[PDB]
Amino acid sequence: MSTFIGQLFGFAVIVYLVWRFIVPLVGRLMSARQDTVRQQLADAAAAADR
Amino acid sequence: ELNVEIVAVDRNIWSGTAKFLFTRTTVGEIGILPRHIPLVAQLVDDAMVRVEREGEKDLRIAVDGGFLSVTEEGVSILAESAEFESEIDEAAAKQDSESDDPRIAARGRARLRAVGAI
Amino acid sequence: MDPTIAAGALIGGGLIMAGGAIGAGIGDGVAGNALISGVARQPEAQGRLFTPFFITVGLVEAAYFINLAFMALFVFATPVK
Amino acid sequence: MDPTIAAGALIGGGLIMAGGAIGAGIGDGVAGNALISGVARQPEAQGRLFTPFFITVGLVEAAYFINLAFMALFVFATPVK
Amino acid sequence: MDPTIAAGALIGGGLIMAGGAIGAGIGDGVAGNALISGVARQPEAQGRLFTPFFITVGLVEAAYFINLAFMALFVFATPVK
Amino acid sequence: MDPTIAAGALIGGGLIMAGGAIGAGIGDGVAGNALISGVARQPEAQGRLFTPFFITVGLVEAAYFINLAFMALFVFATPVK
Amino acid sequence: MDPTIAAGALIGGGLIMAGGAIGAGIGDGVAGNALISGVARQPEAQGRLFTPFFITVGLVEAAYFINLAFMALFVFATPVK
Amino acid sequence: MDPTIAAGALIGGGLIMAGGAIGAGIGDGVAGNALISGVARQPEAQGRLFTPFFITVGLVEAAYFINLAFMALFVFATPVK
Amino acid sequence: MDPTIAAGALIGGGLIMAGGAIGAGIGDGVAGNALISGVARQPEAQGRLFTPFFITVGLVEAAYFINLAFMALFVFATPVK
Amino acid sequence: MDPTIAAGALIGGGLIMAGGAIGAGIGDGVAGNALISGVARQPEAQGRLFTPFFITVGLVEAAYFINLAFMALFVFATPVK
Amino acid sequence: MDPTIAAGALIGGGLIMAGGAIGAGIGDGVAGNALISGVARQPEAQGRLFTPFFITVGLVEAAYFINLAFMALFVFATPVK
Amino acid sequence: SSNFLIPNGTFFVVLAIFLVVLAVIGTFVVPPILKVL
Amino acid sequence: QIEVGEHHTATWLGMTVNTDTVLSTAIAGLIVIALAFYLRAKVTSTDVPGGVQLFFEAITIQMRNQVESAIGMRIAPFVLPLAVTIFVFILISNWLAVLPVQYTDKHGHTTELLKSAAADINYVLALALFVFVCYHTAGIWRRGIVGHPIKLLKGHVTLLAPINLVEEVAKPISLSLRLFGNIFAGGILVALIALFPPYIMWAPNAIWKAFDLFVGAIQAFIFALLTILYFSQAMEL
C-alpha cells in the first residue's frame, strides 16, 4: 500500500501546479467575461432610461 | 511602439504611435508589431487598416488603393482614398458594395469592413 | 516449423505498420502545413481549402489503412500455413 | 517454439513503435511549423488557427496511436501462438 | 526448408509494403501540399491545378501498386521452389 | 528460451528508442526552425510565439515519452515470459 | 542449404524494392510539387514546364526501374547458385 | 545464453546510436538553416536569434544524449544478464 | 558454410541498392524541384540552369552508380571466397 | 561465443556509421542550403554568414565524429567479449 | 564459425554504404537545390555561388567517402576475425 | 492476454448511457444556452 | 510484470459486460447530468452568469461557430447538441483519470478502483459507430436513400471511387482508435510507472498526469471537430 502514497504525492504536486498557474488565468478570463456582460446589461438599462 | 503614417494622394490621413497595426495584403492578413523586418506589400482592393494604441480604442480606416511599407522608421501606408470608421454611413457603404463597378464595389466593401459589418 | 513462420509474419506486419505510420503521419503533416498556412493568410478560405485537403488526406490515409489491412493478412490469416 | 515467436513479437512491436514515433513526431513538427509561422506573420490569429492545427494533429496522431494499439496487441496479446 | 523460405518471404513482403507506403504517403502529401497552396493563393486555378496534381499522383500511386503486386508474388506465389 | 527473448527485447528497445530519437529530434528541429524564423520576422512576438511552440514541442515530446516508457517495458519488465 | 540463400534473396529483393519505392515516391512528390506550384503561379506555362519535370521524373523513375530489374535478378535468377 | 544476448545488445546499441545521430544531425541542420537565413536577412539580428536557436538545439541534443545513455546501458551494463 | 555468406551478401547488396535508390531518387527530386521552379519563374533561364542542375545530378547519380558497383561486388564477386 | 558477438559488433558498427552518415550528410546539406541562399541574396555577407554556418556544421559534424568513435569501440575494442 | 563473421561483415558494409548513399544523395540534392535557385534568381551570381556550394558538398561527399573507406575495412580487412 | 480489440456487450450499455446524456444536454443545456445567447 | 486490460466483468444478458467502463462511464454520465441540472437552475439571461453557464456558453458558441462554418446551423440544428455532448462526455471521462485512485494491490501488482472508460474498445466503438450511423442517416435524409450511397461512392473526384470507399470505411475506425490508443496508452504508463519505488514515482506520475489533462482535452476536441466535419461532408449538396 505504498504506491497509493506515491500517487497521492503526485496528485498533490499536480493540484499545486494547477492552483498556482492555471486557475489564476482561467479565473481572470471568466471574471473579465462576467464584468463585460455586467457592463453590457448596465449600459442597456442606461440607454433604456435615456 | 511603432510609428504609423497613413498618407493619401493629396493629404495625410493619419499619423501617430501604435502598438499593433493589422491589415491585409494581397497575399494574406498581416499584423505588424513595434520591431518588424522591412517589408513592401500591396493591400487588397477592399482593405481595412486597424490601428491599436495603448489607451485609446482601435482606429479602423477603410483604405482604397493602398501600399504598405514597413521599415526601421515604422509603418507607412500609401492610399488613393481613405475613410475613418466614424465617418462612414453604412447605407451608402452597403448599397455601393452591391454595385457592378469593380473598384466602387471594392470601396463599398472596405467601408463595410470599417464600420463593423462583414 | 511454424514458429519461424510466426516470427516472420510478426516482423513483416511490424514493418508494414511502421512504413504505413511514417508515410501517413508525414504526409498528413505536410498537407496540414499547407492548410494551416492557407487559413492563416486568408481565414474565409478555410471552407474552400477543405476540398483539396480532404482529397490529399483521403489518398494518404488510404495507404495507411490499406497497409493496415495487409498487416492483418500477415498476422491473423498468415498467407503461408 | 514460443521463444522465437516472442522474439518476433518484440521486434515487430519495436518496429511498429519506431515507425509510429517517426511519423508522428515529424508530422507534428511540420504542422506546428505552419502554426508558429502563421502566428508570427499575424500574432492575433491563434484562436482562429487552433481549429486546422488540431484537425491536422488529430490525423497525425491517429496514425501514431493506431500503431500504438496494434503494438500493444502484438506484445501483450500476441495474435499468433 | 519451407519454414525459413516462408519467413523470408513474409519479411520481404513486409519491407516491400513498408517502402511502398512510405513513398506513396509522403509523395501524396507533398503533391497535395502543392495543390492546397495553389488553391489558396490562386482560387480560380482549382480546376486546372488538377491536371498536374493527378499526373504526379498517377506516378506516385503507380510505385505503390507495383510494390503491392510484388508483395503478393512474395507471399502467395513465392518465387522460390 | 530466455536468451532469444532477451536478444529480441534488446533489439526491439533499440528500434523503439531509434524511432523516438529520430521523430523527436527532427520534429523539434522543424518547430524550432519555425520559432527562429518567426523571431527573426517579428522580434516583439517572441513571447506570443512560445504558446504555439511549447504546444507543438509538447505534443512531440509526448510521443517521445511514450516510446521511452515502452522501451523500459521491453528492457526492464519484458512483457513475455 | 538453398533455403537460407532463398530467404536471403527474398529479404534482399524486398529491401531493393522498398528503397526504390521510397525514392521514387518521394522524388515524384517533390518534382510534382514544383510542377503544380509553377502551373499555379504561371497558368499558361504548363506546356513549358513538362520538359524539366519529365527530366526529373525521368531520372527518378530510372532508379526505381533499375532496382526493380535487380530485384528480379534476386528472386528469379539468384546470383548465387 | 550470454553470446546471443551480447549480440542483441550490440545491435540494439547500434540502432540507438544510429537513430540518435540521424535525429540530432537533421534537427541541428534545420535549426541552423533557420539561423543562417535569419542572419543573412538581418545581420544585426545574430545576437537575438541565438536564444531560440539554443532552445531548439537544447532539445535536439537532449534526445541524442538520452540515446547515448541507453547505448551505454546496452553495451556496458546489459540490462538482461 | 557457403549458404550463410551467400545470404549475407544478398542482404548486404539489397541494403546497398536500397540506400542508393532512396538517396538518388530523393536527391534528384529535390534538384529537379529547384530546376522546375527556376524555369517556371523565368523560362529564358532554362539553358543556364542546366549547368548547376547537371552538376548536382552528376554528383547524386555518382553515388548511386558507385553503390551499384559494390552491389555487384557483393553478389557476383563476394569478397569471401 | 566469439563469432556471434563479432557479427553483432560488425552489424552494430555498420548501423552506427549509417546513422551518422545519414544525419551528417542531410544536416550539412540543409545548413549549406541556407548558406548558399544567403550568399545569393546578400553577396557581401559571406564572412558574416560563416559564423552561424560553422556553428551548425560544428554541431552536425560533432555527432558524426562521436558515432565514428563508438563505431571503433564496437569493431576494434568490442565491449562484451 | 567464420562464415557468421563474414555474413555479419557483409551486412555491416551494406548498412554503411546504404547510409552513406542516402546521406550523400539527399545532401547533394538539397545543396544543389540552393545552388540552382540562387543561379535562377540572378545568374551573374553563379561564379560567386560555387564557393559556398563546394564547401557544402565538400563536407557531404566527405562523409560518403569516409563510409566508403570503412566499408572496405569491413569487407576486405574485417576488423574482427 | 485476451484480444482486447474484440467488443463485448458493454458496447450497448455505454451506448445507452451516452444515448441518455445526449438527450439530457440536447434538451436541458443547448436550448437554454442558445436562448440566452 | 505489467498486465493489460483485463476487466472485472459479469454476464448481464448472456453478454459479458465489464464492471469497470460501465461504472466509470456511468460516473461520467452522472457528472455531466449534474452539471446540466445545475445549469438548468442557474441559467440567467437577465444578470451576470456564474461559472457553469460560462463554461457551457463557451462550448456551445465554439461548436456552433464550427457547425455554421462547416454545414450551417439552418440545415443541421442537431449536430450542435451532438457535438456538445460528445465533447463534454469524452472530456469528463478522460479527466476522471487524474484522480489518485491507484492503490497498489490485494496481492501482486498495480490496481485502480476506476479505469478510464476510453481505454476500452466498447466505449470508443459505441461513440464512433453512433456518430457513423448518425451522419450516414443525415446524409440519407439530406440527399436520398439512392443518392447518398452514390455520393459516398463518387466523392469529389469520381474516378477515385475506390479510394472514396476506403475513406468511408476509415472514418469510424480512425475516430475510435485515435481515442482508444491514446487513452489506452495512458493506462499502460501509470501501470509501469507504479514499478518505480515510491520516492521516485511521484515525478513521472505528475508529469504524465499533467500532460494527460491536456491530452484528454485535445482528444475530446478532436472527436467533436471531426464529428462536425463528417456531418458537413455527408450532407453537402
Ligand SMILES: COc1nc2ccc(Br)cc2cc1[C@@H](c1ccccc1)[C@@](O)(CCN(C)C)c1cccc2ccccc12
Ligand atoms: C489512385 O489509385 C490507384 N492508382 C493507380 C495508378 C497507377 C497504377 Br499502375 C495503379 C494504381 C492503383 C490505384 C489503386 C487501385 C484501385 C483499384 C484496384 C487496384 C488498385 C490503389 O493502388 C491505391 C493505393 N494508394 C491509395 C495507396 C489501391 C491498391 C490496393 C487496394 C486499394 C483499395 C481501394 C482503393 C485503392 C486501392
Ligand SMILES: COc1nc2ccc(Br)cc2cc1[C@@H](c1ccccc1)[C@@](O)(CCN(C)C)c1cccc2ccccc12
Ligand atoms: C515512367 O515509367 C518509366 N520510366 C522509366 C524511365 C527510365 C527508365 Br531506364 C525506365 C523507366 C521505366 C518506366 C516504367 C516502365 C514502363 C514500361 C515498361 C517497363 C517499365 C516503370 O518502371 C515505372 C514505374 N514507376 C511508375 C513506379 C514501370 C515498371 C513496372 C510496371 C509499371 C506499370 C505501369 C507503369 C509503369 C511501370
Ligand SMILES: COc1nc2ccc(Br)cc2cc1[C@@H](c1ccccc1)[C@@](O)(CCN(C)C)c1cccc2ccccc12
Ligand atoms: C545519368 O546516368 C548516369 N550518370 C552517372 C554519373 C556519374 C557516375 Br560515376 C555514373 C553515372 C552513371 C549513370 C547511368 C549509367 C549508364 C550507363 C552505364 C552505367 C551507368 C546509371 O547509373 C544512372 C542510374 N540512375 C539513373 C539511377 C544507369 C545505371 C544502370 C542502368 C541504366 C540504364 C539507363 C540509364 C542509366 C542507367
Ligand SMILES: COc1nc2ccc(Br)cc2cc1[C@@H](c1ccccc1)[C@@](O)(CCN(C)C)c1cccc2ccccc12
Ligand atoms: C520537454 O521535456 C519533456 N516534455 C514532456 C512533455 C510531455 C510529456 Br507526456 C513528457 C515530457 C517529458 C519531458 C522530459 C522529461 C523531464 C523530466 C522527467 C521525465 C521526462 C524528457 O522526456 C524530454 C526528452 N526530450 C527532450 C528528448 C526527458 C526524458 C528523459 C531524460 C531527460 C533528461 C533531461 C531533459 C529531459 C529529459
Ligand SMILES: COc1nc2ccc(Br)cc2cc1[C@@H](c1ccccc1)[C@@](O)(CCN(C)C)c1cccc2ccccc12
Ligand atoms: C567530389 O568527389 C569527392 N569529394 C571528396 C571530398 C572530400 C573527401 Br575526404 C573525399 C572526397 C571524395 C570524392 C570522390 C573521389 C574521387 C577520386 C578518388 C576518390 C574519391 C568520391 O568519393 C565521390 C563520391 N560521391 C560522388 C558519391 C568518389 C568515390 C569513389 C568513386 C568515385 C568515382 C567517380 C567519382 C567520384 C568517386
Ligand SMILES: COc1nc2ccc(Br)cc2cc1[C@@H](c1ccccc1)[C@@](O)(CCN(C)C)c1cccc2ccccc12
Ligand atoms: C551541446 O552539447 C550538448 N548539449 C546537450 C544538451 C542537453 C543535454 Br540533456 C545534453 C547535452 C549534451 C551535450 C554534449 C555533451 C557535452 C559534455 C558532456 C556530455 C555531453 C554532447 O552530447 C553533444 C552531442 N552533439 C554534439 C551531437 C557531446 C556528447 C559526447 C561527446 C561530445 C564531445 C564534444 C562535444 C559534445 C559532446
Ligand SMILES: COc1nc2ccc(Br)cc2cc1[C@@H](c1ccccc1)[C@@](O)(CCN(C)C)c1cccc2ccccc12
Ligand atoms: C569538419 O571536420 C570535423 N569537424 C568536427 C567538429 C567537431 C567534432 Br567533436 C569533430 C569533428 C571532426 C571533424 C573531422 C575530423 C578531422 C580530423 C580528425 C578527426 C576528425 C571529420 O570527422 C569530419 C567528418 N565529416 C566531414 C563527415 C573527419 C573524420 C574522419 C576523416 C576525415 C577526413 C578528412 C576530413 C575530415 C574527416
